[PDB]
Structure formats: C-alpha cells, structure tokens
Write a protein that binds this ligand. Sequence first.
Ligand SMILES: CCCCCCCC/C=C\CCCCCCCC(=O)O[C@H](COC(=O)CCCCCCCCCCCCCCC)COP(=O)(O)OC[C@@H](O)CO
Ligand SMILES: CC(C)CCC[C@@H](C)[C@H]1CC[C@H]2[C@@H]3CC=C4C[C@@H](O)CC[C@]4(C)[C@H]3CC[C@]12C
Ligand SMILES: CCCCCCCCCCCCCCCC(=O)O
Ligand SMILES: CCCCCCCCCCCCCCCC(=O)O
Ligand SMILES: CCCCCCCCCC
Ligand SMILES: [Cl-]
Lengths: 25, 95, 33, 193
Amino acid sequence: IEFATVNYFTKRGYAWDGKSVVPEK
Amino acid sequence: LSRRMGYFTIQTYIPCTLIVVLSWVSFWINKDAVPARTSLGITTVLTMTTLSTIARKSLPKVSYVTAMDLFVSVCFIFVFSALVEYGTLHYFVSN
Amino acid sequence: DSRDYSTELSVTVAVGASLLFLNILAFAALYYK
Amino acid sequence: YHEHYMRNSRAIGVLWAIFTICFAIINVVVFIQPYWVGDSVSTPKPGYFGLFHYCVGSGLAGRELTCRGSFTDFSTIPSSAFKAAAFFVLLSMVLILGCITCFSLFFFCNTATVYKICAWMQLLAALCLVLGCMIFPDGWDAETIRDMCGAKTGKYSLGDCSVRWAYILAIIGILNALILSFLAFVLGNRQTD
Ligand SMILES: CCCCCCCC/C=C\CCCCCCCC(=O)O[C@H](COC(=O)CCCCCCCCCCCCCCC)COP(=O)(O)OC[C@@H](O)CO
Ligand SMILES: CC(C)CCC[C@@H](C)[C@H]1CC[C@H]2[C@@H]3CC=C4C[C@@H](O)CC[C@]4(C)[C@H]3CC[C@]12C
Ligand SMILES: CCCCCCCCCCCCCCCC(=O)O
Ligand SMILES: CCCCCCCCCCCCCCCC(=O)O
Ligand SMILES: CCCCCCCCCC
Ligand SMILES: [Cl-]
C-alpha cells in the first residue's frame, strides 16, 4: 500500500539517466 | 456446541479481505503501466486461488455452499472483476 | 405464550405507514412548483 | 428563488437516499427473518416459515421448534415456488444494494443519469419483490407446509395459519420501492430545471 501511495505522486514516467545532473530544490 | 472463530478470522477472512484490497490497488496504479497492473491483478487472482484451498480442509465434501465458501467466492469474484475491469479499460483506451 | 399477532402487526403497519407518509411528504415537496 | 430550488432539490435527494437505505434495510430484514406466515390457535402444530427457512414444533406441549431450511442449500427449501420467491427477493436486494453502491457515482457522473439509474434499478427491485410475493403463496401446497398449517391450506389458500409481520413488511417494501423509483425519476428530470 505504501508503494501504491508513492506511485500515486510520481510525475515523470522515466527514471534518472545517470549523466544528467539533478538541480536540487 | 458452538464453533470458535479465531482460526477462521486470522487465516481466511482477513487474508481474503486484504487480497481484495490489493486487487483494488490496481485502480490507483497509473494507466499505461500495463505489466504492473496485469501482474498485480493476475497474481492477486493466484493468491486468492491459493487461499480458497484451505477453506474446506476442516469440512467433509458436502455438496452445498457454506458461509466461508460464499465469502471466499465473493472475494474471488471481486478480484476477477478488478482484473477484467482493467482489461476492458486498456482495450478501450488503446483504440 | 399468547399465540396472537396483533400488536406486532400493529407496530409493523404503524412504521410502514410512517415511512410511506414521509415519502408522500417528499412528493409534496417535489411536485409543488 | 434559484437558491431555494437548489436547497430543496439537495435536501430531497438526501432524504431520498436515506429512505433508499431504509428500504434496503427492510429488504434485507424480510429476506432473512423467517416470519412470513405463522401458526394460529386452530393450527395442529406450532411454527412459522419465511421464503426458504421454516421452523416447526414437535407437538409435546413444548416449543422444541426444530428449524430447517436455507437459501444456500436449495434442497432444503420445501417447494419450487419457495425457491423462485427467495431468488426474486434476493435479486431485489442485490438491485437495491447496487443502487446504494451507485450513490457514489454522483461524484463523477451527471446527477440526472445517476438519479435515473437508481430510478430504473429501484423499479426493477420493486417488480422483483412483487414477483416474489406473488410466487411465494404457490408453495403453500407443499407437504410440510400443509402438515404444519393443516389440510385446508393450498395454492393461494392460507387456511388456518396467519400472515406475520415479514409478509406485510414486504408489501410495504414493494410500495416504498415503487415510490422511491418514481421519486428518483422526477428528481432526475427536475434537476435540469
Ligand atoms: C448503514 C448504511 C450505510 C450505507 C452508506 C453507503 C455509502 C454509499 C457511498 C457513498 C455515499 C456518499 C456519496 C455522496 C455523493 C454526493 C456528491 C454531490 O453532492 O454531488 C453534487 C450534487 O449533489 C446532489 O445534488 C446529489 C444529492 C444526492 C446524494 C445522495 C447520496 C447521499 C448519501 C449521504 C449519506 C447520508 C447518511 C446515511 C447514513 C445512514 C455535484 O457533484 P459535482 O458538481 O462535483 O460533479 C458531479 C457531476 O454532475 C459533474 O462532475
Ligand atoms: C455487489 C453489491 C452491490 C451487492 C452484493 C449482494 C450481497 C450482499 C448478497 C449476495 C448473496 C447474498 C447471500 C445469499 C444467501 C444467504 C443465505 C442466508 O441464509 C443468509 C443471507 C445470505 C448469506 C446472503 C447475504 C447477502 C448476499 C451476500
Ligand atoms: C483500495 C485502497 C488503495 C489505496 C491506494 C492509495 C493511493 C492513495 C492516493 C491518494 C493520496 C491522497 C491524494 C490527496 C489529493 C492531492 O493530490 O492533493
Ligand atoms: C469472454 C470474456 C473474455 C474477457 C474479455 C475482457 C475484455 C473485453 C473487452 C470488451 C469486448 C467487447 C468489445 C467488442 C468490440 C468489437 O466489436 O470488436
Ligand atoms: C438492525 C438490523 C440491520 C439489518 C442490516 C441492514 C443492512 C443495510 C444495508 C445497507
Ligand atoms: Cl442459511
């Protein structure tokens, strides 16, 4: 159920690609 | 004589209810996550099938439904309906 | 045991008439333009 | 005037849902409780019977009401008429529970559509209840029902026994179901204004 709740709030369908730098918020 | 229900509550009713809730969880998974929802539905059906086997261990092979058999059958209908619902949704959204 | 069923039927008819009359009040609130 | 009409429609819808829940309670109670017909002073044996269940007395100046029958096992039902009536009452109960489930559709679907959906489903529940109440007396000619009530009983022939609270409550449920169906129809056709 926790995973279901987590997935409900996932916006993008693609994961991190490694090379791209993540601008932290 | 009156039967006690701790066994049947812990081992049959609560597991069946929770498997039904997990079948409901498929509705909240995002559409187009077809492998996830299909696996969830079909494996919930498999788990319900496994759970329905231990219902009749105590009983003889009586040829009528009991309350426990009715409950397990209704839960199986619910998970089956959830899987068929997602199948219909995917078919009508693809085209 | 007194094998008669009048008070039971009396209360049954009473509650039935009460619910029915409530529904007729619903009609009265409805059809009234 | 518009706010008055909106408040009246909302309140009438809420009360209609409340009465729908009440009718569902009535349908469940009449389906379960075995008090459709009852013994009388002239009855040779004491007991009663519902749609499918039946309790009869042994006849030794004591209750000892041996109880047999169950919808879940159709073999125990005395007659095919009783089986058909019990099935129809169950179908009516399923229909009204379906509308109580469809109350949730007011969140998403248009109010007229949901109102008319429960209007038709309550109408069908009412017709099923009528069919059950009409078919249930046909089984009074069953051998066990005749044994309990007496030889005077028969198809549409009450004889010595008496109708108990469950049968009259079922008739009240028929009336309430038809009324709720009409109320739902008019509410669906009225909310458009
Ligand atoms: C022990 C027995 C337990 C049985 C209980 C079973 C529980 C059954 C499930 C849910 C009930 C709650 C459902 C609430 C739904 C009500 C939601 C609601 O009010 O909707 C508005 C209309 O209002 C309306 O006039 C509709 C009015 C009719 C609502 C009828 C249901 C009222 C239920 C209230 C409960 C009463 C207390 C009962 C406890 C005993 C408009 O909407 P909205 O513009 O956003 O878009 C709709 C579309 O048209 C456009 O998107
Ligand atoms: C899907 C939703 C809308 C409706 C569900 C209908 C449910 C509540 C109905 C369908 C079958 C019904 C059961 C059918 C037979 C019996 C045997 C009887 O001796 C007690 C009631 C009992 C155990 C019923 C209880 C209610 C029941 C479980
Ligand atoms: C059958 C129950 C399954 C449980 C599914 C859990 C997913 C819950 C998702 C809803 C989270 C709350 C949403 C708040 C609304 C908002 O976005 O602000
Ligand atoms: C026998 C049931 C199998 C399970 C079917 C689940 C998904 C069915 C989707 C709807 C099928 C009906 C649509 C027919 C459209 C057409 O004419 O091709
Ligand atoms: C007091 C007896 C209660 C019987 C159950 C009512 C069921 C309502 C279904 C919504
Ligand atoms: Cl039973």
